[PDB]
Amino acid sequence: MLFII
Amino acid sequence: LRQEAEQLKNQIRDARKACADATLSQITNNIDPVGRIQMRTRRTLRGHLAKIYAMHWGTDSRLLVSASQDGKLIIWDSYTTNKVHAIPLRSSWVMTCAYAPSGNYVACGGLDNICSIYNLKTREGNVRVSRELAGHTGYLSCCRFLDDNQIVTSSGDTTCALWDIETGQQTTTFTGHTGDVMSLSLAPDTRLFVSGACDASAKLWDVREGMCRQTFTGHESDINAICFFPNGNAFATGSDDATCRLFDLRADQELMTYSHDNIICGITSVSFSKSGRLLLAGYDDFNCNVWDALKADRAGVLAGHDNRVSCLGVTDDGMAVATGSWDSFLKIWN
Amino acid sequence: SAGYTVLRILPLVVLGVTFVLGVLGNGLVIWVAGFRMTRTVTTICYLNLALADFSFTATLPFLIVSMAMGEKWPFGWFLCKLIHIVVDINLFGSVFLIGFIALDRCICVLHPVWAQNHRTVSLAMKVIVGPWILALVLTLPVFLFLTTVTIPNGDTYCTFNFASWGGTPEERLKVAITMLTARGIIRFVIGFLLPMSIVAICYGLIAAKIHKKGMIKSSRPLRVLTAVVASFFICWFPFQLVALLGTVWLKEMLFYGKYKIIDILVNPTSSLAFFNSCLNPMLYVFVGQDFRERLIHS
Amino acid sequence: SAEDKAAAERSKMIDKNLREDGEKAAREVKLLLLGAGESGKNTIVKQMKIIGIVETHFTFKDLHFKMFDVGAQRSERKKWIHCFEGVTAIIFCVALSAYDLVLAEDEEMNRMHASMKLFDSICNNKWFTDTSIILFLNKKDLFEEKITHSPLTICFPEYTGANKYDEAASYIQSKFEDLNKRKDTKEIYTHFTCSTDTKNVQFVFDAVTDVIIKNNLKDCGLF
Amino acid sequence: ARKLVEQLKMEANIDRIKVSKAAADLMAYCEAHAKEDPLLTPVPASENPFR
C-alpha cells in the first residue's frame, strides 16, 4: 500500500 | 348465601384486626441490620441462544438446569461451567423447568401444555423422554418435584394439579384460584405448597387433602413469583406491582411489604437464602435487588444482566445465587 | 516556501488526529461489540475491521515520527520491518474488509434467502480470514524485499534494497524496477480497482433494490450509502492515483527526476487514506442503533 | 487432571452441537397467528401445510417457515405474549364477513370490533414495537355476497356508502392500518385470502422477504 | 357460590396466631441460622467452591 521507493 | 358471604369475607378481616397487634418491622427495629451485601458474578454460563425463563438449583449445589426458548434444556455444572447434558426439547416454547431432589429427573413445561420429564441416568448415555404429562388446558407456568414419583405442576388454566410420573395421570387437582397460576413453591417437608395466580391472591394448598387450606389476599397485581421461608411457616410473593409481600401461614396476615419508590417494574422471581434473612427478588428493571426479610432495607444489588432477569434461585447449601435473564446468560453470584 | 512548509506540516497533524481518533474508535468498537453482545456475521466483520484499523493506528506514531524528519527511520531494522509489515497488512486487510462488507450487504439485499440459510458464523469466519491470507500474500514482497539502507551521509532509510538478489548493478536495477512496477500494478488493481468496483456495484445494487422495492422511509439510508461510497473514493482514489503515476513514471524519477510533484504529493494522499482508515469505525459501526444503545448503556 | 478433561471435552462436544442447532434454528422464519372466532386461521394453514401451540414447518422457495398457532391458549395473552418477542412477522387473520356476526360468548359486543381491539393490542404491545404484521382478510368470497345484504352501518356508522366489495374491503383494510400507532417502524402487509394455488403462500414469502431485508439492514446500520 | 362459601368457611376456622408472636418467631429462625448463611456472612475463598 505504502509508496516506498 | 350472598348476604352471609360478604359478612364471611369481612369476618376474616374482622378477625385479622384482633390478630394485627404489632408489625414485623416494628419489632425488628432493635435487631442489627444486615447492611450492604456485595455479590460478584463468579461465573457466567454462556450456552444459550435465546431468552431464559426458569432455572432450578440442585440439592447437591453443583448441578443446575436452565430452560430457554431455543429448544434445548441444559444441565449446568456451576462449579466449572460444564454442560452435563443438552436436552433437545420437542417444543421450544418452554417457560418452566424442574430438577428432581434425587437428581435423576428433570421436568420442563411451557405453552405446549405438556410437562415432559427427562431421564438423566440413561444407560446408553443420551437423555430420553421419560414421560409427557398431558391434561392441562392452560400453559405450564411452574413445576416442582416432590420426589421422583410425584410432581406438582402449576398451569395457566387457573388450576394446579399434582401428577405421578410412573402413573402418568393427575393424582389430584387443586382448584379455587381465579386468575392464571404463574408461580408455585414447595415446602421443605413437601406436605404443603402455594400457588401464585393473576388474581393477586396466594392460596395455601394441602397436597394430601387437595383443597385450599388457607388464602392470602394482600397484593394488587399479577403475582409472578412465590417462595416459602426456609422454616416453612412463611412465604413471600413477588407480583407486578413492584412490591414483595411476606405472608405468615400461622397468622393469616401481611407480615411486611418490601417496596421501594425507585422501582415500579414487576417482580419475576423471588427466593430466600438458607437462613431466610436475604430475600433476593428479580425485577424488570434489568437487575436484581436483595431485600432484608426483616426490615425491608435493600441490602444489595445484582446488576449486570443485559436483559430482563426472569429466574433467580438460591441453592440449598447457600453457596451461590444463580440469576438467569433474557440475554441468554446465567450469572453465578455469591 | 511558506506553502510547501504548510504542505509538509499538515500531514503530521492529519496523522496525529488520525491516530487519536482511530485508537479511540477501534478500542470502543472492540470493547463494545466483541465482548458485550452476541456474535453476528456483521458483528464479526465489524470486529475484523476494528482490529485491522487498531493494529494500523497502533504503529502510526512510528510513521509519524519517520516522516517528521524526511522519511528517516530512527529505530532499528527489525522494528522497521515489523512496523512496515503491520501497516501494509492492516491497510490491505481494511480495504478487503470494506469490500467484503459491501459484498455481504449486497448478498443480504439481493438474495435474502441465501443470507438467511447459507450465511453462518463458521463460514463467515473462514471467508473473513481468507482476505487476511490475501493481504499477507500481497505483503509478502514487504516481507522479503525490504531491508534497512544507510546512506553515506549517515542518515538511514529502510526502503527496498536489491544488492543481494541481483549481484550486478544493471541486473539489480532491472529487478528493482520490474518488482516496483509489479507492486504498483498489484496495488492499483487489487487494492483499488477490485474493492472500488465491488463497493460501487454492491452499494449501487442495494440502492437500486431499495428504491425499486420502496423501503426508503427516510433519507438516512441513502445518506449512509453515499457517505460510505464518497468517503472511500475521495480518500483512496487520490492515493492510488498518485502511486500509479509514480510507478508508471518511476524510471524517470529514479534516473532523472522529471516528475518531483509525486514525491511531495504522496504524503497528503497517504494522510487522507489513513484518515479513511480511522473514520471507518465511525462510518460503518457507529451508524447502527444497537451499537449506539450498547455504548450509551456502557 | 484427566477426569476433568473428559468432562470438559463433553462440554466442547455439546457446545459444538448447540451452535450447529442454533444455525438451523436461526435460518427458519418464525410466524405467529392471532385472531380467534372463525377468523380464518384454520383456513390459512391449509394451503401452507405441505410439511398447546400448533407448530407447522414448511419450506417455500428454499426458505423455511415455522408457524405458531396460539388459538388453543384460552388464558391471559399478556402473560405469555412476551415469549414471541423476536418473531419475523405476525400473521393476523380477520374474517371479512364478520361485521354482522356477533361473538358467541358476548352477544352485546360486535365480533368485528373485537378483532380490531385484539389487533390494536398487539400493535400497541411493547413486545412487538418493530415486528411487521402480515394482516390477512379471510372469507373474501363470502364477503362479496354478504356486502349487498348487510351494510357497514351495524359496525361502522361513519361509512360514506358504496356498498361494493372493492370499496368496503379497502375501508376495512384502511381501518385496521389506522390502528398501527407505531408508524415508520411496523409495516402491515394486508392481503385478501385468495383460493388460487401458490398465491397465498407467495404473499407471505414476499412479505417475509421484505421484513428480512429490513431486519438485515437494521442490524448492519443501514436502517 | 356454594363452593366459594365452603372454602371460605374452611379457612375461617383455622387458628390465627397473633402477628406479634409470628413476627417474633420468624426472627428467631433467622438468628439461629444466621451463622450458616454464606450470603449474609461471606466465607473465605477456600470454603467457597466458586473461587
Numbering used by the authors:
A (entry chain L): 1 to 5
B (entry chain B): 7 to 340
C (entry chain R): 19 to 316
D (entry chain A): 6 to 56, 184 to 355
E (entry chain C): 12 to 62
Passage from the reporting paper:
In response to the N-formyl peptides from microbes and mitochondria, FPRs play crucial roles in host defense and inflammation. Although FPR1 and FPR2 share 69% sequence identity, these two receptors display distinct ligand-binding preferences.
To enable structure determination of FPR2, a thermostable construct was generated by introducing a mutation S2115.48L (superscript indicates residue numbering using the Ballesteros–Weinstein nomenclature) and truncating 5 C-terminal residues (E347–M351). The side chains of the N-terminal formylated methionine in fM5, fM9, and fHN and the residue D1 of Aβ42 insert into a conserved binding crevice between helices III and VI at the bottom of the ligand-binding pocket, forming contacts with L1093.36, F1103.37, V1133.40, W2546.48, F2576.51, and Q2586.52. In the structures of formyl peptide–FPR–Gi complexes, the N-formyl group, together with the main chain of the residue fM1, forms a polar interaction network with three charged residues D1063.33, R2015.38, and R2055.42 in FPR1 and FPR2. In addition to the conserved binding site for the N-terminal formylated methionine at the bottom of the ligand-binding pocket, accommodation of the formyl peptides is mainly mediated by two hydrophobic patches in FPR2, which act as two “arms” to stabilize the extended conformation of the peptides. Residues L/Y2 and I4 in fM5 and fM9 form extensive interactions with ECL2 and helices II, III, and VII of FPR2, while the fM5 residues F3 and I5 and the fM9 residues F3 and I6 face to the opposite direction, making contacts with ECL3 and helices V, VI, and VII.
